[PDB]
């Protein structure tokens, strides 16, 4: 293999004498020649570790470099400032000052420039950090909302220009909000061009999917896949018009990238530099597990696709530091955590605490998201979880089977309950949602609905806006980045046209992808409106949240409360969080409080608690006690 110098030293044979002097002497190229030194023996084992002794590794890398000095020196001195400081402080994302939110820009805001009108909300609701979905040019009709993209470097027409989008980045940098960017890198449309020249036998785009000639090859991968969307097609594989099937883990016109093919790597890390210098400060990585394939296995969580991920972060290291990933791992838990680390994924989205706050409401038992909570959430040094309540997408129940039974649960027979209850087919559920993606194979379902849909809202139960408070108290308190999904700070309730409109009506994950409602957002500073409940609830929330040390970092404890209904855990040795999961007054007994202070203030409701006695939670009711 070859090294630093000898890279970067070709690196520099672009130049002639004379510019090549003022090139070294630079400033630019001292940071990139030491960060070279220090990540590039990272990124090619990495590398090797995938590729092996494949003949294009080094014309690659050699190719990838030199447009990662390029990117850097083209990179602008505001980012380069923000590289400097994320260098020196690989901890900020775990900051209680830090809070997420997420919005569709044509949903939330009709176009860029309109989202560029509602920073100064984000800003009042204390937002540090907003996820936008994806913004660029897609099929017309049918995009998987977006996700299955026509062109990296074309915006949307209908949200504006990459020149809005750079002006959007930058506003919300001035007001004190990183831009978060979907890196959609697993797979193209297939009217995206590479997609296109592959399939038409372009030499120069040969490999970049995987392209068969008949089912006999899909039809042995298929003994091992589990489909995803159950509805749209079997297994991985959709059939060209000339006869042949392409790999398509997703909708029929979302092609998997091949990167078994290391122009592939180059490609899409091309990309990631593009969106890099666009001043993109956390890249959503959506869909990590599927990146690797391999007959005889389920295709996903291989150990390649890691080495894959590992090295794109070594990508970033060298030539945009700022920029850091988020993992989309919505598998196992033992597979979910694997992701996360400084050198690979340094956040990830929790979807096991987000599926478990929904089980709990459900079961108003605490049992499994206590074990979670006290064996799954404390993570390696440098990284966090992403911690939500609900999201673009429907909800799965990706708890482990293995942890349930330990339980005495039977994960399968649990889920079936699960997806009776959030659809309304359970009696007494307080649950409005609707099915997503029923599996005739496994049994198995998700569940469609916004968080106000899911808790009652829809109906005005009274228990509703509570419901919502605890939920989203768990997220914003355990430690970890908190997401919120905007349009849920005011009580928003599922689209009322989805399930008509033919573009959405095989894909209900639509019914909790509705339109900024101009109607509760106006009632948000009135506290008689559900809307002004849940805005003064939540703003509160992360008011105390971003102003008070003890949530600081992403460690928790447990505490055992000794009540079924009841959650408990502390953070920093200082914050006591209870948070009843019943809609029926629950106790701590004072023998269960005993070890902690006679008195101390919680933070949520303003009062001095007494606990030397009996503490009695009202219906949903959270505490956050100042214990030190
Ligand atoms: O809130 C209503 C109800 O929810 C909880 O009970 C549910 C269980 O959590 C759930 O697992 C399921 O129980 C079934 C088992 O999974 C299955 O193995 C077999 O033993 O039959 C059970 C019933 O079908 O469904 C129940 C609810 O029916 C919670 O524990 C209850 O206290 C609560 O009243
Ligand atoms: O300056 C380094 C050294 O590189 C040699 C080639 O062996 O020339 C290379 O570097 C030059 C300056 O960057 C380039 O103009 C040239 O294309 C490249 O081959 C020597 O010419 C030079 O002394
Ligand atoms: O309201 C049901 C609505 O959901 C759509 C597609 O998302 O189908 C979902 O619900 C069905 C059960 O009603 C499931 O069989 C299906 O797998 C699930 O995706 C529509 O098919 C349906 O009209
Ligand atoms: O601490 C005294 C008394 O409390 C009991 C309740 O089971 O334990 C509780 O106290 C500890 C104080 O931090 C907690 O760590 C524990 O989780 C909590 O349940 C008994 O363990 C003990 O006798």
Redesign the pocket.
């Given at each position: 293999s070859p090294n630093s110098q000898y890279l970067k030293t070709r690196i520099l044979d672009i130049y002639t004498p004379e510019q090549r002097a003022g090139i070294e002497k630079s400033e630019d190229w001292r940071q990139f020649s030491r960060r070279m030194d220090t990540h590039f023996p990272k990124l090619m084992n990495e590398l090797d570790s995938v590729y092996g002794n494949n003949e294009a590794l080094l014309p690659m890398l050699e190719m990838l470099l030199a447009q990662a000095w390029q990117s850097y020196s083209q990179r602008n001195s505001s980012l380069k400032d923000i590289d400097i400081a994320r260098e020196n402080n690989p901890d900020w994302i775990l900051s209680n000052k830090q809070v997420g939110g997420v919005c569709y820009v044509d949903l939330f805001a009709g176009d860029l420039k309109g989202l560029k009108d509602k920073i100064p909300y984000f800003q009042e609701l204390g937002l540090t950090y907003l996820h936008l979905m994806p913004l660029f040019k897609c099929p017309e009709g049918k995009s998987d909302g977006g996700y299955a993209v026509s062109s990296y470097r074309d915006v949307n027409p209908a949200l504006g220009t990459i020149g809005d989008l750079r002006e959007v980045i930058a506003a919300l940098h001035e007001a004190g909000i990183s831009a978060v960017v979907d890196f959609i890198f697993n797979h193209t449309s297939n009217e995206h061009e590479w997609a296109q020249r592959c399939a038409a036998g372009d030499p120069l785009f040969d490999n970049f999917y995987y392209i068969f000639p008949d089912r006999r090859m899909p039809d042995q991968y298929d003994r091992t896949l589990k489909e995803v969307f159950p509805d749209q097609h079997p297994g991985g594989f959709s059939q060209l018009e000339d006869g042949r099937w392409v790999w398509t883990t997703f909708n029929s016109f979302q092609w998997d990238l091949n990167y078994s093919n290391p122009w592939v790597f180059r490609a899409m890390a091309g990309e990631m530099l593009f969106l890099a210098n666009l001043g993109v400060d956390i890249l959503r990585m959506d869909a990590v597990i599927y990146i690797w394939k391999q007959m005889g296995t389920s295709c996903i969580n291989l150990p390649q696709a890691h080495a894959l991920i590992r090295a794109f972060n070594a990508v970033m290291r060298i030539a945009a530091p700022a920029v850091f990933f988020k993992s989309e791992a919505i598998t196992h838990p033992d597979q979910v955590v694997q992701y996360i680390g400084q050198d690979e994924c340094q956040i990830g989205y929790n979807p096991l605490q987000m599926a478990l706050l929904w089980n709990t409401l459900?079961?108003?038992?605490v049992n499994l998201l206590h074990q979670a909570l006290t064996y799954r959430h404390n993570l390696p040094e440098h990284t966090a979880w992403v911690n939500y309540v609900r999201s673009h997408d429907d909800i799965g129940w990706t708890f482990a089977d293995e942890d349930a039974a330990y339980l005495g649960?039977?994960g399968y027979?649990?889920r079936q309950?699960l997806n009776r209850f959030f659809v309304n087919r359970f009696d007494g559920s307080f649950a409005r949602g609707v099915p997503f993606s029923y599996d005739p194979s496994t049994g198995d379902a998700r569940v469609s609905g916004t968080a106000a849909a899911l808790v009652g809202l829809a109906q005005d139960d009274p228990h509703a806006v509570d419901r919502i408070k605890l939920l989203y108290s768990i997220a914003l308190s355990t430690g970890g980045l908190p997401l919120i999904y905007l349009g849920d700070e005011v009580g928003t309730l599922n689209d009322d046209d989805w399930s008509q409109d033919s573009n959405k009506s095989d894909d209900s994950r639509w019914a909790h992808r509705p339109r900024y409602n101009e109607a509760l957002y106006a009632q948000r500073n009135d506290p008689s409106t559900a809307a002004g409940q849940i805005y003064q609830d939540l703003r509160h929330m992360i008011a105390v949240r971003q102003s008070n040390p003890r949530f600081d970092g992403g460690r928790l404890v447990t505490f055992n409360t000794n009540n079924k209904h009841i959650i408990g855990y502390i953070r920093n040795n200082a914050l006591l969080a209870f948070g009843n999961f019943s809609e029926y007054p629950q106790t701590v007994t004072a023998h269960t409080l005993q070890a902690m202070p006679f008195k101390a203030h919680d933070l949520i409701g303003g009062k001095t608690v007494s606990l030397n006695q009996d503490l009695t939670l009202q219906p949903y009711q959270v505490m956050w006690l100042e214990i030190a």
């Open positions: 459900a079961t108003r038992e649960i039977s027979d649990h309950f």
